[PDB]
Write a protein that binds this ligand. Structure first.
Ligand SMILES: Cn1nccc1C(=O)N1Cc2ccc(Cl)cc2[C@H](C(=O)Nc2cncc3ccccc23)C1
Ligand SMILES: Cn1nccc1C(=O)N1Cc2ccc(Cl)cc2[C@H](C(=O)Nc2cncc3ccccc23)C1
Ligand SMILES: [Cl-]
Lengths: 302, 299
């Protein structure tokens, strides 16, 4: 019993964190085999961030301009290339602690663990979700650039995010490990803002099924709804539209609890109308949306 | 910017998790140097000296990854079983066994079959239980803090109470709370809110630009403790006030000034508003957790 926001054990990722320095900039790198991946804005000198020409800045660099530090050991850079917004530094030593890994690009609503680092040293681990507006509500301070988001599947680490920047509302933007940004963001300190955020409906439903699995049923009702009527209601509360794929994905949880997906949708509709009336669901006074259907199955059953 | 419930990096602890099997029971063990520590109920009113005397070293199957460790001795210290093994753990970090006080937080590495599956942050409740997330097989999972490079082991999971909350011991086998390691009628006492932690979380909200709850008022410590007693909040001591000093100096809001904000929040509620994305007053962040997360301390 119990339901917590749980992160993956960070050990396999900790053994990959390095510190990357170029001139006066210091950020984090991910050392996998003989390559160190880091944000390409490590080559920028702040008054470059408005309109940086990364190809022009990178052509003026040599291998010995990049100082890479893994613990108390300096790694020697023997090559460098840019792939989208990530800089790949070829090093002379392969990481002996390299786990089994993959680079995966995730979709909004997906969750992942973040190992927050400063100066190549991990300081904390937390769980979070890719928001529908492509930002993450992280906990990052200056120097956290290059911190990574991941999931662990059996013994394989799936790298899905690299931290690049903080937007004006306090939210964060970054790229997949191939350097492609999530969202319409760019590695420039130009006027950019996160779009209006919405609630991840399929995740709230998954969390309502987890509450039922843990013995809480107060919010259920005798009603059902059509998918269309549910979306008509939910959009008025800034909830993401629920698709037939979301309904299909919730099938296992529906079969385990005996509550049809559209019956649970009627309960959610009523919760949005009434609020919680002093009650909580899994120790929360708000409807939680940072647990996917997959997270619920993994934590409530295994 | 941002404020998350953050756990310590679990790597130094992952390298210590082993699977312990005795008969039909399988749980987790903590392998430090040449000793494996695990709940003594793995051998299961039970007379544990009588049950343990009937066991031999080869009855305990210890598995570290895909390698079987050979047990060469065994002894009991309170509610923890100590299994002497032939191989010292090469991944043993610098460590200490520490006993924590209620209100103090720690990271939990939840494990099943000697394999770590998740890490989460939680607090020792005033009623000595933890609101964890555990299933059958979690027994022997450990709670810890990391101080520089030293891991401080403070908790070992033993059981789940009827309300869904958890009970365990320190690494010396002494239970937190009036609990016993057996199948009997026991229940968690009435819980209370950790006041010093709520205040720390209100200071973290101010640091992140959330000031709506602030007011021009102050209060005496005595007048505030009468309010705390009425709302099932733990009494706030002069030590708690002293501990909050750095946060008070950083934000410019005196501790008793923040107590007046909490008093108004307790008597009037949040009125549709949230603080750090929460509609409830959060109490599982200590004053030190707030300073550490709002400064970027590494391990
Ligand atoms: C935040 N900001 N708003 C205007 C100017 C800045 C600013 O400090 N930076 C500008 C900037 C622009 C584009 C890119 Cl790709 C990176 C950056 C850097 C950045 O965003 N770094 C940070 C990354 N993550 C959490 C941070 C928290 C607190 C400070 C900094 C953080 C530097
Ligand atoms: C919970 N319960 N109510 C009646 C009987 C049991 C019961 O399963 N156990 C009895 C018991 C008695 C004393 C001690 Cl020290 C440990 C235990 C064990 C325990 O509590 N283990 C668990 C520990 N943590 C989360 C669990 C989740 C689901 C199952 C088990 C869990 C087993
Ligand atoms: Cl995805």
């Amino acid at each position: 019993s119990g339901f917590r926001k749980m992160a993956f054990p960070s050990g396999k990722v900790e053994g990959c964190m390095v510190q990357v320095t170029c001139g006066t900039t210091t950020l984090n790198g991910l050392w996998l085999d003989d390559v160190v991946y880091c944000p390409r804005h490590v080559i920028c000198t702040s008054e470059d961030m408005l309109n940086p020409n990364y190809e022009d800045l990178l052509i003026r660099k040599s291998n010995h301009n990049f100082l890479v530090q893994a613990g108390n050991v300096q790694l020697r850079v023997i090559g460098h290339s840019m792939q989208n917004c990530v800089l790949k530094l070829k090093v002379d030593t392969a990481n002996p602690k390299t786990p089994k890994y993959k680079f995966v690009r995730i979709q909004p609503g997906q969750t992942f663990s973040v190992l927050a680092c400063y100066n190549g040293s991990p300081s904390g681990v937390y769980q979070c979700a890719m928001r529908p507006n492509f930002t993450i509500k992280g906990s990052f301070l200056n120097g956290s650039c290059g911190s990574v988001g991941f999931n662990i599947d059996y013994d394989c680490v799936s790298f899905c995010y690299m931290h690049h920047m903080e937007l004006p509302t306090g939210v964060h933007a970054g790229t997949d490990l191939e350097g492609n940004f999530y969202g319409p963001f760019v590695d420039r300190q130009t006027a950019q803002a996160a779009g209006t955020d919405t609630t991840i409906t399929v995740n709230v439903l998954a969390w309502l099924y987890a509450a039922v699995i843990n013995g809480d049923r107060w919010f259920l009702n005798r009603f059902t709804t059509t998918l269309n009527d549910f979306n008509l209601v939910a959009m008025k509360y800034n909830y993401e539209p629920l698709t037939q794929d979301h309904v299909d994905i919730l099938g296992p949880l529906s079969a385990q609890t005996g509550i049809a997906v559209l019956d649970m949708c009627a309960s959610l509709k009523e919760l949005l109308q009434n609020g919680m009336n002093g009650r909580t669901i899994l120790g929360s006074a708000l409807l939680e949306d940072e647990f996917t259907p997959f997270d619920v199955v993994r934590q409530c059953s295994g």
